[PDB]
Amino acid sequence: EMVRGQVFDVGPRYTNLSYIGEGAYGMVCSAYDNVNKVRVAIKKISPFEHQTYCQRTLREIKILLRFRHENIIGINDIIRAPTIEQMKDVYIVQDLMETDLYKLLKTQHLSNDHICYFLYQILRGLKYIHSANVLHRDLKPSNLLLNTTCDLKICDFGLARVAEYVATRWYRAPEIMLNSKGYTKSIDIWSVGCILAEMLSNRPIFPGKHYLDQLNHILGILGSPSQEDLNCIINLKARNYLLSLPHKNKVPWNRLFPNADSKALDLLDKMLTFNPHKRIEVEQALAHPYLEQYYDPSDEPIAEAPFKFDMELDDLPKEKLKELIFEETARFQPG
Numbered sequence: 001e002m003v004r005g006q007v008f009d010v011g012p013r014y015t016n017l018s019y020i021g022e023g024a025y026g027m028v029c030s031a032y033d034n035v036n037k038v039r040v041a042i043k044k045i046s047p048f049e050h051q052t053y054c055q056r057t058l059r060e061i062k063i064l065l066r067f068r069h070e071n072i073i074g075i076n077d078i079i080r081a082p083t084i085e086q087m088k089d090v091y092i093v094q095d096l097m098e099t100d101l102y103k104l105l106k107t108q109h110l111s112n113d114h115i116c117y118f119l120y121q122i123l124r125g126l127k128y129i130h131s132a133n134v135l136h137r138d139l140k141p142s143n144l145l146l147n148t149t150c151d152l153k154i155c156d157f158g159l160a161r162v163a164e165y166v167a168t169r170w171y172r173a174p175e176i177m178l179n180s181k182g183y184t185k186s187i188d189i190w191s192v193g194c195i196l197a198e199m200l201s202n203r204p205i206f207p208g209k210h211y212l213d214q215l216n217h218i219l220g221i222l223g224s225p226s227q228e229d230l231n232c233i234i235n236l237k238a239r240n241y242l243l244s245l246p247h248k249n250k251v252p253w254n255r256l257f258p259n260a261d262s263k264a265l266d267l268l269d270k271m272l273t274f275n276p277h278k279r280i281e282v283e284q285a286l287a288h289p290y291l292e293q294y295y296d297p298s299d300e301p302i303a304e305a306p307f308k309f310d311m312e313l314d315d316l317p318k319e320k321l322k323e324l325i326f327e328e329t330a331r332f333q334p335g
């Protein structure tokens with residue numbers, strides 16, 4: 001009934017609730033599933049007052065129900081009020097993972113073997129997403145769930161789009177910088193690159209007090225971009241800043257990561273290129289020598305049918321969004 005003083009009405013199927021995490025994606029608890037005799041994850045969402053949350057909620061539900069892949073979190077069950085009027089909250093039931101990459105990298109050290117396997121699962125999952133004509137747009141360590149068996153799943157597709165206020169900027173590609181457009185598939189690639197770098201050193205590769213500071217860190221490592229690579233268009237200010245800077249020298253990757261696999265550093269390099277047009281794509285990344293021990297196209301499935309929202313969710317008012325959410329969740333009701 002209650003968790004930390006907040007209502008969490010998911011019984012009678014789900015009991016023994018234990019609080020695990022808050023977030024912009026809702027309140028997350030673990031719980032014992034009486035039916036499947038296993039502990040699960042349940043996410044409570046209360047999105048119906050803000051058109052934004054209703055969008056994020058609908059995208060998440062719709063995406064994860066259509067998606068089916070080993071390295072992508074699924075939805076076991078959705079609990080909500082039997083009538084649309086009473087529906088204030090929505091509980092999404094998902095597989096309970098032991099941790100996320102953010103919590104792991106905070107305190108634990110990864111060997112190359114783990115890093116290589118984690119990265120493989122990331123890209124394998126990302127290939128499926130991209131084949132679905134979908135951008136994740138928010139890849140970060142906290143969105144990568146893990147088991148002790150080292151199985152990994154990508155989660156939180158609340159900000160996904162078909163191929164604005166920002167929280168964390170550490171994993172955003174330089175071209176999106178400031179509050180700009182999440183446009184190409186290459187932005188996810190950049191995010192994976194940043195995630196790889198963090199796996200190698202247990203620290204954010206590109207931190208910054210503001211986006212100019214962040215950009216400076218990026219040039220501090222990659223070095224000054226060529227005029228051709230200076231396709232920073234989505235801001236006069238950001239572009240004029242870069243043009244003013246003195247030349248900056250590229251730091252050799254092995255100088256930053258002296259204990260890293262050379263192949264890992266080579267692939268890291270192709271992911272973290274300033275020019276998005278020059279970045280390696282997911283299928284070519286899976287075919288990189290660093291991942292050759294796991295590489296197998298026949299075992300790297302694509303989406304059975306690409307995505308295309310039948311209506312512009314941004315244009316829909318919150319009341320109709322609520323209707324579509326109600327309809328989408330119907331199949332988890334009796335009948």
Ligand SMILES: c1cncc(-c2c[nH]c3ncc(-c4cn[nH]c4)nc23)c1
Nearest residue numbers: 041094095096097098099100155156
């Ligand atoms: C969307 C957003 N946030 C968490 C989830 C999630 C589903 N199943 C899970 N299982 C374990 C965890 C976890 C987090 N931190 N430590 C463990 N999260 C989830 C989905």
